[PDB]
């Protein structure tokens, strides 16, 4: 419970100034889903107190606390890989041109994995557990929580030009039930940690 | 009153209210006297407040306010307000023998005086008055429902002591009752529907909302409006 | 609401409780938003994040207490506040459960509540049958 | 467990002589149900040891211990308000005549609320939680237990002329399931406390 | 020096939460000037951090610190009465209709005294020194400083409906110099004290 809004550490790091969850729109998970991604802080630059701090200051320095919750019955099955990818330089498929500004900076709506098997950058989803990650096996649990530190070589950074973390939610085992028409909502809540801003 | 809260049940209820207002004519020809069974069901503003509770224990501070008007000079008349409790005999007429009763407490007051005032004590044989009685009075099936025989205060009989005169004047007797030393038990929901009688708790509701049978609160367009 | 209409000036904190009355396996999220007096009543779920709001997963809980802060009542005499509720997710039920589920809302006053300058209630008012039986 | 028969305090009161539950007939709760009520001790005057104590003595003085249990599956929904009403003087609808002896003294079978929204006495069901009450939300619990003290201005009373308590069971959220033909039984068990009788 | 912006107590009162001067537009004082007035916090409701606190919260509670500075040469003469008037209910001249919303709520620009001799409310300018006030005699000084407490019977108040203080600047001796065409600027700086806001 942070702020007024109510509802594991990456690499063993705990980040230590305004001090709440920004619940994004629920995405709807079906059998044909490939995945979802949100780049941070691009998902939060147009929202609320953090958006007023971004659009009026010039440098940002903050960690992130992400709670992904996937609410289903006991007759649903499926596994998600909720993985946070630092510096997720996306590649484009079958072309030599780099992805544009529209292909990367999707805002609050986020994006969809085109080829989640290669994480859309020629790497592998199988080895994607080298990142900070949690699994949502609907048989077992329905939620995931990832702490994200300040991931930068630089001390402070530009929020409108660069996205340090990418939260990815990839269905490894697809959504299943008997009458294959069911949907399961996934709700993402992102709380920034230690919101340091400069250059008012 | 002098508490701190202003929502004390003493403060919420001890407040003088016109419980009875009846004129009666008086002339040289042979009702010519006032009689009223002491309850609070008669006026719905005091009734709904006392029906917030199941059991009430209070003294009753009666205040008889008497005016006279022509049908020259308003005559100074002597009145007798006599409290006949439950178990004693009531006057059938203005000149009956029951006005001379030694044991029925009378009070003799003039129109020129300040208004007469008595305190009727806690008259019940139980430890509280039953505002709501879920039972029957008599031991037969012909008993009435909701009427505790132990719950009746008494009667307040008011006449003009003076002999009959040929002059034409109407005497209006306003009775103001103010509870005292109120103890109250087991609070109840406030009544939403309008009353139909004073003998019971029957309900019909208004024609449209608010306070209708199937809609107590007046409607709005949609829940999202 | 009934006892306070016997008084003219109220002041205190209210306490809303919402109880979800669906089946055991019904799951979903609501978002209950409190709007202070004079603020804009929200229409979209995205707009209602600038005020006091909570996200209620009614799979986990079945009841939610929403403390309304101290108002001071008849100081305004535009509205005196709002509590709205938006869907966050859909309602997820199994096939044997009913696909329509209900909410019950409660309200009480808190310990700092206050009523003064007593009047008579607007709710009751006036025939009475057997009214002349007492005479 | 009281006596031989095996299966919260009103206002903070615990009543302190024969010393068991009288399980009434189960009522059947459906979608179209309005409510049920039982007046005490009228529900127990024709039953067992308490009925032999009522019909052979002249005054009664006892508290009551009520266990309402509503047994359903996890696919049923609905909420009950199990509320005990002291001195529930019933009103009749749309007439000036008071309710008769047959309309009030229903015995072991009890009655049904005609207009449960107004509690059949012109008051409100919304404010009916001012009484001792418990909720049965089938999502959450299936049982309720209400202790009832000696509720009388009088020291002892007449069991055949007056009913001090009225146990009411009112479905606030109706019974729901997918195939809307299902029933859920409600079982009421009433145990008298400190059975004092006089005038054999 | 308060905040980042750089440049006596009323009734003996010192008011004790964001913690700077809002320099209003300079008014130009000439021989034909009658006076200027600014209602507080109406002069500050559309400005800066205080304006964002007013337009997003619902109740305000703050004192004021006012510095009026009138910068002239040693060949100018004239006296100002810088007077702060609590609850300055303005009257309109030669009519029975009360002043409208436009006649009272002038914003950052403020207003001009029509009849400063009667303080525009039928009272007197001669007795206007009963208020907190300072004199700017250009012979002697060029500045004035008035502390304004929370002046309200109420504990908190409505900034968009009510103006507690009115800062008035009235030239008692008119501006004089030999070639009577000269102007002298008057600069008003208002710093709010103990900015308490409620109802975000």
Token match 């230590």: residue? A16
Beta carbons within 10 angstroms of residue B135's beta carbon: 24
Which chain E residues are Cβ-neighbours of C51 within 8 angstroms?
200
Q: How many helices (H) and strands (E) does chain E have?
A: 2, 10
Q: Give me the DSSP letters along E78-109.
A: EEEEEEEEET--PPPTT-SSPP-HHHH--TTS
Token match 């529930």: residue? D88
- Which two structure tokens, joined as six digits, stand for A102? 């529209």
- Nearest CA to CA, how far is C128 from chain D (Å)? 10
Nearest CA in chain C to D80: C21
List chains touching D (3+ CB pairs under 8 A): B, C
B124 phi and psi, to 5 degrees? -80, 155
Provide the 3-class DSSP secondary structure of residue C36.
coil
Which residues are within 8 A (CB) of B47 and not within 5 positions of it... i.e. 6 or more apart? B40, B41, B195, B198, C124
Provide the 3-class DSSP secondary structure of residue D51.
helix
Element (H, E) at A48: helix A48-56
Q: What is d(CA D60, CA D54) in angstroms, rounded to the nearest whole number?
A: 7
Q: Enter the DSSP assignment of D46.
A: T
Q: Do B188 and D130 touch (CB under 8 A)?
A: yes
Q: What is d(CA E149, CA C27) in angstroms, rounded to the nearest whole number?
A: 54
- Which two structure tokens, joined as six digits, stand for A142? 């329905």
C-alpha torsion B130→B131→B135→B139, nearest 10: 60
Residue E58 has its nearest CB partner, among C38, C50, C52, at C38
Q: Give me the DSSP letters along B68-128.
A: EEE-------EEEEEEEEBTBPPPSSTT-GGGG-SSSEEEEEESSSSPEEEEE----SSSS
Which chain C residues are Cβ-neighbours of E161 within 8 angstroms?
none
Residue B109 belongs to domain with CATH number: 2.60.120.20
Element (H, E) at D49: helix D48-56
Alpha-helical runs (H) found in A57-151: 101-104
Residues D159/D138, Cβ–Cβ less than 8 Å: no
Nearest to B47 by CA among B155, B164, B141, B188: B188
- Which two structure tokens, joined as six digits, stand for B149? 């025989």
By residue count, chain C amounts to: 135
Provide the 3-class DSSP secondary structure of residue A59.
strand
List chains touching C (3+ CB pairs under 8 A): A, B, D, E
- Nearest CA to CA, how far is B200 from chain D (Å)? 6
Query: Across chain E, where does the E strand assignment appear?
Result: 22-23, 27-29, 36-40, 59-70, 77-86, 111-112, 133-137, 143-148, 165-176, 184-198
Residue D153 has its nearest CB partner, among B55, B134, B190, at B55
Q: Is the peptide bond before E41 cis (omega within 30 degrees of 0)?
A: yes
* End-to-end Cα separation, chain D, in angstroms: 29
Residue D79 belongs to domain with CATH number: 2.60.120.20
Tell me the residue range of the domain where B6 lies.
1-225
Residues E169/E66, Cβ–Cβ less than 8 Å: no
Residues D186/D80, Cβ–Cβ less than 8 Å: yes
Q: Enter the DSSP assignment of E118.
A: G
Q: What is d(CA A102, CA A92) in angstroms, rounded to the nearest whole number?
A: 13
Nearest to D118 by CA among D162, D76, D88: D88
Residues D139/C24, Cβ–Cβ less than 8 Å: yes
User: Measuring CA to CA, how many Å separate E54 from each of C22, C65, C68, C114, D90?
Assistant: 43, 29, 21, 28, 55
Element (H, E) at A36: strand A36-40
Provide the 3-class DSSP secondary structure of residue A101.
helix
- Which two structure tokens, joined as six digits, stand for A179? 């009458």
CB contacts < 8 Å between B and D, how many?
122
- Which two structure tokens, joined as six digits, stand for E114? 């029509």
Q: What share of chain E is helix, strand, coil (3-state, %, to 5)?
A: 10, 35, 50
Interface of chain A against chain C, CB under 8 Å?
4-7, 21-23, 25-26, 28, 47-48, 69, 71-75, 108, 179, 183-185, 187, 189
Residues A70/A143, Cβ–Cβ less than 8 Å: yes
Q: What is d(CA E135, CA D184) in angstroms, rounded to the nearest whole number?
A: 86
Buried/exposed code over D127-147 (b: 16+ C-beta within 10 A; e: otherwise): bbebbbbbbbbbbeebebebb
Q: Do C29 and A47 touch (CB under 8 A)?
A: no
Nearest CA in chain C to E156: C75
Which chain C residues are Cβ-neighbours of E58 within 8 angstroms?
36-39
A10 phi and psi, to 5 degrees? -75, 125
Residues D195/D51, Cβ–Cβ less than 8 Å: no
Q: What is d(CA B94, CA B30) in angstroms, rounded to the nearest whole number?
A: 10
The answer to whether residue B8 neighbours chain D at the CB level (below 8 Å) is no
Which residues are within 8 A (CB) of E11 and not within 5 positions of it... i.e. 6 or more apart? E132, E149
Q: Is D45 exposed, middle or buried (0-12, 13-18, 19+ CB in 10 A)?
A: buried
Provide the 3-class DSSP secondary structure of residue D19.
coil
Nearest to C54 by CA among E58, A43, A28, A23: A23
Q: Do B192 and D123 touch (CB under 8 A)?
A: yes
Beta carbons within 10 angstroms of residue E200's beta carbon: 13
Regarding chains E and D, contact by 3 or more CB pairs under 8 A is answered as: no
Which residues are within 8 A (CB) of B72 and not within 5 positions of it... i.e. 6 or more apart? none
Q: Is A57 exposed, middle or buried (0-12, 13-18, 19+ CB in 10 A)?
A: middle
Q: Do A71 and C46 touch (CB under 8 A)?
A: no
Residue B203 has its nearest CB partner, among D93, D101, D131, at D93
- Selected residues 65-124 of chain C with any CB under 8 Å from a CB in chain A: 88-90, 92-95
Domains: count for chain B? 1
Tell me the residue range of the domain where E121 lies.
1-200
Which residues are within 8 A (CB) of B175 and not within 5 positions of it... i.e. 6 or more apart? B18, B19, B20, B21, B36, B62, B63, B64, B65, B156
Residues E198/E59, Cβ–Cβ less than 8 Å: yes
**C-alpha dihedral sign at B47, B53, B57, B58:** negative
- Nearest CA to CA, how far is D78 from chain B (Å)? 21
Q: Do D119 and B196 touch (CB under 8 A)?
A: no
Which chain B residues are Cβ-neighbours of D117 within 8 angstroms?
213-214, 216
Which residues are within 8 A (CB) of D187 and not within 5 positions of it... i.e. 6 or more apart? D23, D24, D26, D68, D69, D70, D71
Q: What is d(CA C17, CA C62) in angstroms, rounded to the nearest whole number?
A: 10
Angle at Cα E42 formed by Cα E38 and Cα E45, nearest 5°?
Answer: 130
Residue D77 has its nearest CB partner, among C95, C101, C130, at C101
Q: Do B36 and C134 touch (CB under 8 A)?
A: yes
- Bridge pairing between strands E184-198 and E59-70: antiparallel
Beta carbons within 10 angstroms of residue E145's beta carbon: 14
Which residues are within 8 A (CB) of E38 and not within 5 positions of it... i.e. 6 or more apart? E24, E106, E110, E111, E166, E167, E188, E190
Nearest to D139 by CA among C23, C92, C26: C23
User: Measuring CA to CA, how many Å separate A17 from each of A23, A193, E5?
Assistant: 21, 10, 21
Task: HSE, CB side, 13 Å, CA atoms: give it for residue A134.
Answer: 19
- Selected residues 20-79 of chain B with any CB under 8 Å from a CB in chain C: 22, 35-37, 39, 41-42, 44-45, 47-49
Provide the 3-class DSSP secondary structure of residue D117.
helix
Provide the 3-class DSSP secondary structure of residue D162.
strand
Residues D22/D47, Cβ–Cβ less than 8 Å: yes
Nearest CA in chain C to D137: C21
Q: What is d(CA E160, CA E180) in angstroms, rounded to the nearest whole number?
A: 41
Q: What is d(CA D191, CA D5) in angstroms, rounded to the nearest whole number?
A: 10
Q: Is the peptide bond before A41 cis (omega within 30 degrees of 0)?
A: yes
Domains: count for chain D? 1
Q: Do D162 and B192 touch (CB under 8 A)?
A: no
Beta carbons within 10 angstroms of residue E25's beta carbon: 11
Q: Give me the DSSP letters along chain B.
A: ---SSS-SHHHHH---EEEEEEEEEE-S----SEEEE--STTSHHHHHHHTTEEEEEEEEEEEEEEEEEE-------EEEEEEEEBTBPPPSSTT-GGGG-SSSEEEEEESSSSPEEEEE----SSSSEESS--BBSSSSTTSPBT--GGG--EEEEEEE-SPP-SS-EEEEEEEEEEEEEEEEEEE-PPP-SPB-BSSS--B--BSSSSSBSS-SSPP-S-TT-
List chains touching A (3+ CB pairs under 8 A): C
Regarding chains C and A, contact by 3 or more CB pairs under 8 A is answered as: yes
């Amino acid at each position: 419970k942070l702020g007024n809004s109510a509802i594991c550490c990456a690499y063993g790091e705990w980040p230590n100034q305004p001090e709440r969850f920004y619940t994004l729109k629920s995405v709807k998970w079906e059998a044909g889903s490939t995945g979802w991604w949100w780049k941070l802080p691009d998902a939060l630059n147009n929202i609320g107190m953090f958006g007023q701090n971004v659009q009026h200051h010039y440098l940002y320095r903050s960690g992130f606390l992400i709670h992904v919750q996937c609410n289903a019955t006991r007759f649903h099955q499926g596994a998600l890989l909720v993985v946070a990818i630092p510096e997720h330089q996306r590649g484009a498929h079958n072309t030599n041109t780099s992805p544009g500004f529209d292909d990367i900076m999707k805002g609050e709506e986020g994006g969809t994995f085109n080829h989640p098997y290669v994480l859309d950058d020629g790497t592998s989803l199988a080895c994607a557990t080298i990142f900070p990650h949690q699994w949502i096996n609907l048989r077992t649990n329905n939620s995931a929580t990832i702490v994200l530190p300040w991931m930068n070589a630089a001390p402070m950074d530009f929020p409108l030009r660069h996205n340090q973390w990418t939260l990815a939610i990839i269905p490894v085992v697809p959504l299943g039930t008997r009458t294959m028409s069911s949907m399961v909502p996934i709700t993402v809540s992102i709380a920034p940690m230690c919101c340091e801003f400069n250059g008012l | 009153q002098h508490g701190v809260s202003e929502t004390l049940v003493e403060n919420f209820l001890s407040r003088a209210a016109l419980v009875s207002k009846r004129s009666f004519e008086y002339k040289d020809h042979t009702k010519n006297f006032f009689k009223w069974t002491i309850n609070t069901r008669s006026f719905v503003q005091l009734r709904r407040k006392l029906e917030l509770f199941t059991y009430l224990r209070f003294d009753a501070e009666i205040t008889i306010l008497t005016t006279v008007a022509v049908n020259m000079g308003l005559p100074n008349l002597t009145l007798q307000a006599m409290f006949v409790p439950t178990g004693a005999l009531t006057p059938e007429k203005q000149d009956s023998f029951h006005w001379q009763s030694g044991s029925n407490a009378s009070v003799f007051f003039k129109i020129s005086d300040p208004p007469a005032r008595m305190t009727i004590p806690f008259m019940c044989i139980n430890s509280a008055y039953s505002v709501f009685y879920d039972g029957f009075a008599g031991f037969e099936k012909s008993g009435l429902y909701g009427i505790n025989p132990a719950d009746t205060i008494g009667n307040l009989c008011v006449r003009i002591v003076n002999e009959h005169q040929p002059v034409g004047f109407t005497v209006t007797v306003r009775v103001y009752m103010k509870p005292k030393h109120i103890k109250a038990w087991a609070p109840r929901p406030p009544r939403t529907l309008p009353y139909m009688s004073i003998a019971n708790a029957n309900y019909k509701g208004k024609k449209r909302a608010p306070n209708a049978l199937n809609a107590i609160i007046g409607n709005r367009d949609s829940v999202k409006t | 609401g009934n006892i306070s209409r016997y008084y003219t000036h109220w002041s205190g904190s209210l306490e809303m409780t919402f109880m979800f009355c669906g089946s055991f396996m019904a799951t979903g999220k609501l978002i209950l938003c409190y709007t202070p007096p004079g603020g804009s009543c929200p229409t979209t779920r995205e707009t209602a994040m600038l005020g006091t709001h909570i996200v209620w997963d009614f799979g986990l809980q079945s009841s939610v207490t929403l403390i309304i802060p101290w108002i001071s009542g008849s100081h305004y005499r535009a509205n005196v506040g709002y509590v709205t509720c938006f869907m966050q997710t859909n309602l997820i039920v199994p096939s044997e459960s009913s696909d329509t589920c209900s909410l019950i809302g409660f309200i009480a006053a808190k310990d700092d509540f206050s009523l003064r300058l007593m009047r008579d209630s607007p709710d009751i008012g006036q025939h009475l049958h057997a009214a002349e039986a007492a005479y």
